[PDB]
């Protein structure tokens, strides 16, 4: 007789969640969002906030230049496809006066353009 067990199934997340439960918080270390260099430590809460807002500033820096120039990045190399690494196109690709273009600029959140072509 073989007591062959049925395979219990998980997602991609539970192993790393158990790993974090192994690594509870470090009572002597700074939050991981900041770096680990003593020169790059925030000393005060205001300095930490300035560091964080500078980092979010750089994030939307790359977001702005990427969405301004989507041609330089259309080549995907990663598989499977990552739509949140694909460019977000903010210009209306539908130019004729149509309801498809109406839904298009409604999705693109262009209020004056939607009103004008309505």
């Amino acid at each position: 007789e073989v007591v062959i067990p049925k395979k219990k199934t998980w997602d991609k997340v539970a192993v790393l969640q158990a790993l974090a439960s192994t690594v509870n918080r470090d009572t002597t270390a700074v939050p991981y969002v900041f770096q680990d260099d003593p020169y790059l430590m925030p000393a005060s809460s205001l300095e930490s906030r300035s560091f964080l807002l500078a980092k979010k500033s750089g994030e939307n820096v790359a977001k702005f230049i990427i969405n301004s120039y989507p041609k330089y990045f259309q080549k995907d190399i990663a598989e499977p496809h990552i739509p949140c690494l694909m460019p977000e196109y903010f210009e209306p690709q539908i130019k004729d006066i149509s309801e498809a273009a109406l839904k298009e600029r409604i999705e693109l959140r262009k209020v004056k353009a939607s009103v004008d072509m309505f």
């Binding site: 770096q35 680990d36 560091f51 980092k55 979010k56 750089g58 790359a62 977001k63 990552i82």
Partner: protein
């Protein structure tokens, strides 16, 4: 004479690091490799574009971190996390440092389509291994 990657002795007043000081025949006897990617072993396919992206990365980080990189980077590559680990100096302000880290983080993640992580390491002055 051989001068592939050997810095020549000027007069005894020339600051130089370990990597620039050591010759290419000490490349795995004393130095190690500045980029760790898996393309160069027995069975692999994509090592050519690994190399072209390696030189792209070196020139790009040098162009976008102007005059603050002490010596050459460490370009590590495991799975799909790229690691640019840096030895950056302590001259420019940390707001600029975090700004360029986020800028580079996002653009290289976006250009190579993976998790790309830059880990800075701040050094006061460019370190001297010997004076030649």
């Amino acid at each position: 004479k051989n001068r592939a990657a050997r810095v020549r002795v000027s007069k005894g007043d020339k600051p130089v690091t370990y990597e620039e000081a050591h010759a290419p025949h000490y490349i795995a006897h004393r130095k190690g490799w500045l980029s760790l990617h898996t393309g160069n072993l027995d069975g692999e396919d994509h090592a050519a574009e690994r190399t072209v992206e390696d030189v792209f990365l070196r020139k790009f980080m040098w162009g976008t971190f102007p005059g603050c990189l002490a010596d050459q980077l460490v370009l590590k590559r495991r799975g799909n996390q790229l690691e640019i680990c840096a030895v950056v100096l302590r001259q420019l302000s940390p707001h600029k440092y975090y700004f360029l880290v986020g800028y580079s983080e996002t653009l290289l993640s976006y250009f190579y389509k993976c998790p790309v992580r830059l880990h800075l390491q701040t050094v006061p002055s460019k370190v001297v291994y010997k004076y030649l």
